Amino acid sequence: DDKMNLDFIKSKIAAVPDFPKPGIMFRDITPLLADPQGLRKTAEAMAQELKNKGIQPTIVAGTESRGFIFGVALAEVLGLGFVPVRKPGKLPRATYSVKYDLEYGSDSLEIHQDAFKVTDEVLVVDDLLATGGTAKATVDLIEKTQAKVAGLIFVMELDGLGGREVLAGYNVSALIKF
C-alpha cells in the first residue's frame, strides 16, 4: 500500500519529448491532477515521507505555479497554512526578493515580509528538483525573514543534476527519481 501508491503516481506522469524546446524531456503532471486520487495520494505519500524522517513543519511554501498545486494539496493534509513564493510584481505588500541565474538567463522570486513568523519551520514544496537553483533561491528568501527551513520535498528528482548537492544542509525528499 506504500509502494503501490508510488507506482500509481508514476503511472500518471507522462513523459513528453522535446518540450519546451528540442532536446529536453518534460514530465507532464496533468493526468495525475485530473485523476480524483492523484493529488490526494501525492500529498499523502509526501506526508508519509515527512513522518518517516521526523520533519514537522509549521507552514508550507510553494513556487508559482506547480509548487502552488502540490503545496496546497500537502498543506491541507498536514493542516498547515500556505505561502506563495512568486514572480516579481504579483505580491501586493512589502516583499523580500532574491535574484538567481537559471537555464534561460536570470529572474527573481519574492515573498511578503510577514509571510513567516520568527517561530516558523517552513516546508518548501515543488514539483521537480533539477539543478536546485530555484529551490536554493527560495531557501535564501525564507531565511531573510529569520524563519528556518524545516526541509524541502519534491514530487520528482532528476538523478545526478546536482540539486541535492546544492541543498546540502537542508533535509531533501523526493518521491520519484527519473
5, 6, 8, 40: which one binds its own copies (CB under 8 A): 40
Contacts by 173-176, CB closer than 8 A, 24 or more apart? 173/46, 173/49, 173/50, 173/53, 173/55, 174/129, 175/6, 175/9, 175/42, 175/45, 175/46, 175/49, 176/6, 176/9, 176/10, 176/13
Residue 19 binds Cl ion, judged by CB under 5 A: no
Question: For residue 42, what are the contacts with CB-CB under 8 A and spacing of at least 6?
Answer: 9, 32, 70, 73, 74, 155, 175
Give the nearest distance from C-beta 39 to its own copies in angstroms: 6
Which residues have a Cβ under 8 Å from the Cβ of 89 and sit 6 or more positions away?
A: none
- Number of Cβ within 10 Å of residue 8's Cβ equals 16
Using CB under 5 A as the binding rule, whether residue 66 contacts Cl ion is answered as yes
Task: Kindly tell me which residue out of 115, 142, 153, 174 binds its own copies, with binding defined by CB under 8 A.
Answer: 115
In the annotation, is 103 catalytic? yes
Strands 25-28 vs 14-17: parallel, antiparallel or unpaired: antiparallel
66 flagged as catalytic:
yes
Q: Which is nearer to Cl ion, 13 or 123 (CB)?
A: 13
When the beta carbons of 55 and 76 are compared against Cl ion, the nearer one is 76
* Residues in 74-93 at the binding interface with its own copies, rule: CB under 8 A: 75-76, 79-84, 86, 89-93
158 binds its own copies (CB under 8 A): no
The size of the interface with Cl ion (CB under 5 A), counted in residues, is 3
Contact positions vs its own copies (CB under 8 A): 14, 16, 19-20, 26, 28, 30, 33-36, 38-40, 43, 59, 64-65, 68-69, 72-73, 75-76, 79-84, 86, 89-93, 112, 115
Contact positions vs Cl ion (CB under 5 A): 65-66, 84
